[PDB]
Curated annotation (Swiss-Prot), chain A:
InterPro entries per record: eIF2B_alpha/beta/delta, elF-2B_alpha_N, IF-2B-related, IF_2B-like_C, NagB/RpiA_transferase-like
Miscellaneous field: Present with 8970 molecules/cell in log phase SD medium.
Function: Acts as a component of the translation initiation factor 2B (eIF2B) complex, which catalyzes the exchange of GDP for GTP on the eukaryotic initiation factor 2 (eIF2) complex gamma subunit. Its guanine nucleotide exchange factor activity is repressed when bound to eIF2 complex phosphorylated on the alpha subunit, thereby limiting the amount of methionyl-initiator methionine tRNA available to the ribosome and consequently global translation is repressed.
Keywords per UniProt: Acetylation, Activator, Cytoplasm, Initiation factor, Phosphoprotein, Protein biosynthesis, Repressor, Translation regulation
The organism of origin for this protein: Saccharomyces cerevisiae (strain ATCC 204508 / S288c)
Keyword match Acetylation: yes
Source domain of life: Eukaryota
Subcellular location: Cytoplasm, Cytosol
Summary of subunit composition and partner proteins: Component of the translation initiation factor 2B (eIF2B) complex which is a heterodecamer of two sets of five different subunits: alpha, beta, gamma, delta and epsilon. Subunits alpha, beta and delta comprise a regulatory subcomplex and subunits epsilon and gamma comprise a catalytic subcomplex. Within the complex, the hexameric regulatory complex resides at the center, with the two heterodimeric catalytic subcomplexes bound on opposite sides.
Protein name per its UniProtKB record: Translation initiation factor eIF2B subunit alpha
A biological process term (GO) from this entry: cytoplasmic translational initiation
Modified sites of kind Phosphothreonine: 288
From Swiss-Prot, chain B:
Effect of residue 50 to A: Inhibits derepression of GCN4 expression in amino acid, purine, and glucose-starved cells
Result after altering residue 82 to A: Alters the binding mode to the eIF2B complex
Coiled coil residues, start to end: none
Function text: eIF-2 functions in the early steps of protein synthesis by forming a ternary complex with GTP and initiator tRNA. This complex binds to a 40S ribosomal subunit, followed by mRNA binding to form a 43S pre-initiation complex. Junction of the 60S ribosomal subunit to form the 80S initiation complex is preceded by hydrolysis of the GTP bound to eIF-2 and release of an eIF-2-GDP binary complex. In order for eIF-2 to recycle and catalyze another round of initiation, the GDP bound to eIF-2 must exchange with GTP by way of a reaction catalyzed by eIF2B.
Family according to the record: Belongs to the eIF-2-alpha family.
Modification type Phosphoserine: residues: 50
Assembly, per entry: Eukaryotic translation initiation factor 2 eIF2 is a heterotrimeric complex composed of an alpha, a beta and a gamma subunit. The factors eIF-1, eIF-2, eIF-3, TIF5/eIF-5 and methionyl-tRNAi form a multifactor complex (MFC) that may bind to the 40S ribosome. Interacts with CDC123; the interaction is direct. Interacts with GCD1.
Stated name of the protein: Eukaryotic translation initiation factor 2 subunit alpha
Record note on modification: Phosphorylated; phosphorylation on Ser-50 by the GCN2 protein kinase occurs in response to low amino acid, carbon, or purine availability. Phosphorylation inhibits the guanine nucleotide exchange factor activity of the eIF2B complex.
Cited InterPro entries: NA-bd_OB-fold (IPR012340), S1_domain (IPR003029), S1_IF2_alpha (IPR044126), TIF2_asu_C (IPR024055), TIF2_asu_middle_sf (IPR024054), TIF_2_asu (IPR011488)
Swiss-Prot record, chain C:
Section covered of the full-length record: 237 to 593 of 651
Biased composition (Basic and acidic residues): 342-352
Family, similarity comment: Belongs to the eIF-2B alpha/beta/delta subunits family.
Subunit text: Component of the translation initiation factor 2B (eIF2B) complex which is a heterodecamer of two sets of five different subunits: alpha, beta, gamma, delta and epsilon. Subunits alpha, beta and delta comprise a regulatory subcomplex and subunits epsilon and gamma comprise a catalytic subcomplex. Within the complex, the hexameric regulatory complex resides at the center, with the two heterodimeric catalytic subcomplexes bound on opposite sides.
Name of protein: Translation initiation factor eIF2B subunit delta
Organism name: Saccharomyces cerevisiae (strain ATCC 204508 / S288c) (Baker's yeast)
Designated gene of the protein: GCD2
Length: 302, 246, 355
């Protein structure tokens, strides 16, 4: 019952409510029309909706992951096997409840993740994730001892936007280019990376470069980080150095030209392995090594 | 072509039992075809299927006993449950399924013969048998014992019916050696033959007579053959001739 | 049991973690010993084809046969000496050649089954169901696992792939065959093989018999086809709760090379391959046969020739030792796919609690 329109409505909004959250809410609303009890009508419709979303998707898996999570939750729901109405009611409730949970998660983050800041340590935030920014803000509020650093990111000018946002706060800001990151080995103290998806074990999807950063960190023996809230748990694993669903072509040796037509093509998306990251940042207590995989195992049983 | 529902109506009810044949698992549960109520797919979610390694099995061929929860009688949507079915009537359900299968098997000769749609044939069969009596296998059995159900309907194909009847519907051998020495012989042989006949009796060459005795209820065979042998023995000794039984 | 020891060859100063030699030629055999087991042992003594997976299946089959042959005695009960017999068999197997983790698991399962069924039950009725259950187990924990592996491969592997493998990993061979003939895609499959075993060669032959384009390789170089090679699966035998692999021959070398050049390696396995025992070097437990695979001057296995080679004790001190099973590393095989579909070998015992 319409998802393309919803997609159209949300792309550069975020800020207040997370992009994925809105999608989740929409999914919940869709569910709460055709009845979750009648599984014959419902699950097929859900599948169709997912397919539609995929069709509408260019360069993302996050939405797909969210919908899978939702499905899993729904599956879990009916395990009371008694009165069938209460479960339905609960299902109906869990949509805006999810949104509410986000605030709580943020609050939790503002209490557990504020222990990390030490004497003279330079912080560099990679990509675009709201949670990381919130954490940074909360650290600033606490006034431990830090430095907030930005990047020259290249999707649709994200890095610049981030820099501008930082400027609002007031904290002194200097920039790092995608190429000029190589000089950073010990001076910027700890390497932080924001997430737009967390897979099985160490697998994280963001923007136009993470793997290289991870490699650099490994070389330097630097502390590498994955920072997020709570809505991104995926069952995924790649085979090569990098493997993902792609709309932007990998190594597209552009056709013979003289007056310019199409050129901006390459690895737009980036993955990270298990070995490179030292710490995982989620509101779910204090979990790090391979807890997400365990969670997945608990959930799927497949 | 194999189609058509087992009962009178297309779509199942609430609380009724059905047997399913599994095709594919995971992601949803089992959106699978039925062998008790039509070939159209019916689905179970990953919760009602199991109770007590669950993902290890349930692929192709294996059958599951399930109760119907939700039926959408508009376009075609069926919902099932495995957990609710208790192991008190499970055997009965199985028996019912078997009976249904047998009935289905019975309705194949007709399909083979006159090269016409199977569903119509099924309908024509189900009107006397499946409607008034209850279950069909028992009705069939009754008919084969004492014709009582075939009276209600006129047959478009009587030959096919006859064939079906035939389908629905043990030879023991004996050796006798003759080697006479007395005056008369051929007549004596004939007499002997007449004492061992009653079905199928055939001649091979010269010294051996082969007769096949049909058994009524498996064990029967010695209760006539031995008597015949005795009779034969009685026959040949009087004049001046010898015969041997191995 | 019969006769043991009385064999040539020294204890060796270098590498002696496990005992090195046995029963090959039969003389004065016991009355109660089933000949199938003996035959199997004879085969294994000089085997080319099997490795890890099919061996276990064979063992299972043998066990089933034995069960079929055996009935409940008048004096002794069904659970009276069966366990002892099993133990004896295990000992015999050990004497012949060291075994796998899968086999151990199977044995454990059998023991559990034995424990389960009470001796007071009707005997005929008992094994009728027991055999069925065994069959079901076989279907599930092997064939179904294989199917699952295949399906995992299907979703993951790109539109037609160049594939590199080593050894006699039967499951992988089957997968390759499926890719070739059933789903129909391009199969530039490269197989490597060593001197002592002709497993790779055999695999290549089999592929040819099915109609597959194969690239044959040896020890001297591997990189000659790499420097092009895009996606690689390794040879498998047994997994540990470290995240490491206990596998055959120079697979470790291959893995290292892969790590060095472009792309890591991945291995798919059965859900009942995993152990709870652990080790971390090629000195821990060594699997050994007789130093005779390289005595015959290349080519075929049964030849019998006159030449120069054959100096184990003849000349002034000479030792010709080798190894079969070596340690495969951890940081490089990132992939592990089982009956639980998806996961990493970094999650070394995540499925051991669930089972």
């Amino acid at each position: 019952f319409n998802i393309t329109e919803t997609y159209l409505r949300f792309l550069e909004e975020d800020t207040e409510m997370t992009m994925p959250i809105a999608a989740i809410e929409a999914l919940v609303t869709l569910l709460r029309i055709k009845t979750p009890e009648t599984a014959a009508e419902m699950i097929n419709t859900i599948k169709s909706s997912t397919e539609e979303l995929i069709k509408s998707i260019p360069n993302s898996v996050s939405l797909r992951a969210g919908c899978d999570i939702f499905m899993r939750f729904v599956l879990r729901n009916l395990h009371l096997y008694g009165d069938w109405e209460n479960c339905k009611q609960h299902l109906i409730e869990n949509g805006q409840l999810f949104v509410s949970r986000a605030k709580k998660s943020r609050n939790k983050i503002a209490e557990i993740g504020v222990d990390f800041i030490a004497d003279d340590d330079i912080i560099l935030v990679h990509g675009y994730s709201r949670a990381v920014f919130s954490l940074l803000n909360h650290a600033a509020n606490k006034f431990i001892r830090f430095r907030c650093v930005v990047t020259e990111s290249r999707p649709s000018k994200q890095g610049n936007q981030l820099y501008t946002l930082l400027e609002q706060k007031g904290i002194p800001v200097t920039l790092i280019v995608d190429s000029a990151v190589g000089a950073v080995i010990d001076k910027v103290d700890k390497v932080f990376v924001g997430a737009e998806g967390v897979a099985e074990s160490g697998g994280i999807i963001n923007l136009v470069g993470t793997y290289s950063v991870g490699v650099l960190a490994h070389n330097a023996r630097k502390p590498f980080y994955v920072v997020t809230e709570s809505h991104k748990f995926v069952r995924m694993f790649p085979l090569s150095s990098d493997d993902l669903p792609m709309a932007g072509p990998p190594l597209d040796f552009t056709r013979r030209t003289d007056d310019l037509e199409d050129a901006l093509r390459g690895p737009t998306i980036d993955y990270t392995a298990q070995e490179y990251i030292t710490a995982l940042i989620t509101d779910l207590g204090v979990l790090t090594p391979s807890a997400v995989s365990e969670e997945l195992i608990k959930m799927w049983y497949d | 072509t194999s189609h058509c529902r087992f009962y009178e109506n297309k779509y199942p009810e609430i609380d009724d039992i059905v047997m399913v044949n599994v095709q594919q698992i995971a992601e949803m549960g089992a959106y699978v075809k039925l062998l008790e109520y039509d070939n159209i797919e019916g689905m179970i979610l990953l919760s009602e299927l199991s109770r007590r390694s669950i993902q290890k099995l349930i692929r192709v061929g294996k059958n599951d006993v399930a109760v119907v929860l939700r039926v959408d009688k508009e376009k075609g949507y069926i919902d099932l449950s495995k957990r609710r079915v208790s192991s008190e009537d499970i055997i009965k359900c199985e028996e019912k399924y078997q009976k249904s299968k047998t009935v289905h098997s019975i309705l194949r000769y007709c399909a083979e013969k006159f090269q016409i749609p199977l569903e119509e044939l099924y309908k024509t069969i189900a009107w006397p048998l499946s409607r008034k009596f209850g279950h069909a296998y028992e009705a069939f059995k009754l008919s084969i014992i004492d014709e009582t159900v075939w009276e209600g309907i006129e047959p478009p194909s009587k030959d096919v019916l006859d064939e079906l009847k035939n389908y629905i519907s043990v030879k023991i051998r004996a050796d006798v050696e003759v080697s006479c020495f007395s005056y008369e012989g051929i007549d004596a042989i004939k007499d002997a033959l007449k004492s061992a006949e009653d079905v199928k009796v055939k001649l091979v060459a010269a010294p051996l007579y082969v007769l096949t005795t049909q058994a009524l209820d498996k064990q029967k065979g010695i209760e006539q053959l031995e008597s015949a042998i005795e009779k034969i023995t009685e026959v040949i000794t009087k004049y001046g001739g010898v015969c041997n039984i191995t | 049991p019969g006769i043991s020891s009385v064999i040539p060859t020294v204890l060796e100063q270098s590498f002696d973690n496990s005992s090195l030699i046995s029963v090959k030629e039969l003389l004065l055999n016991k009355d109660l010993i089933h000949p199938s087991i003996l035959l199997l042992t004879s085969h294994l003594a000089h085997y080319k084809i099997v490795g890890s997976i099919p061996r276990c299946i064979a063992m299972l089959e043998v066990f089933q046969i034995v069960i079929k042959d055996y009935q409940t005695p008048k004096g002794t009960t069904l659970s009276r000496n069966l366990t002892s017999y099993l133990s004896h068999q295990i000992d015999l197997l050990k004497k012949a050649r060291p075994l796998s983790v899968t086999m151990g698991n199977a044995i454990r399962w059998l023991k559990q089954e034995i424990s389960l069924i009470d001796p007071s039950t009707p005997d005929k009725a008992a094994k009728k169901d027991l055999c069925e259950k065994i069959g079901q187990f076989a279907k599930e924990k092997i064939e179904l696992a294989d199917q699952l592996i295949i399906d995992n491969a299907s979703t993951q592997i790109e539109e037609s792939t160049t594939i590199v493998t080593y050894g006699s990993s039967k499951v992988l061979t089957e997968l390759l065959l499926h890719n070739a003939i059933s789903l129909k895609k391009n199969i530039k499959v490269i197989v490597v093989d060593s001197r002592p075993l002709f497993e790779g060669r055999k695999m290549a032959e089999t592929l040819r018999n099915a109609g597959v384009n194969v690239m044959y390789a040896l020890i001297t170089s591997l990189d000659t086809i790499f420097n092009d090679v895009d996606y690689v699966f390794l040879g498998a035998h047994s997994i540990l709760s470290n995240g490491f692999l206990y596998s055959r021959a120079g697979t470790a070398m291959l893995a290292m090379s892969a790590k060095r050049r472009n792309i890591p390696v991945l291995v798919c396995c059965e859900s009942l391959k995993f152990s709870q025992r652990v080790q971390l070097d090629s000195v821990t437990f060594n699997e050994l046969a007789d130093p005779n695979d390289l005595v015959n001057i290349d080519y075929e296995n049964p030849v019998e020739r006159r030449g120069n080679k054959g100096a184990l004790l003849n000349q002034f001190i000479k030792e010709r030792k080798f190894e079969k099973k070596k340690l495969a590393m951890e940081n490089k095989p990132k992939g592990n796919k089982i009956g639980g579909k998806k996961g990493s070998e970094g999650e070394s015992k995540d499925a051991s609690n669930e089972e």
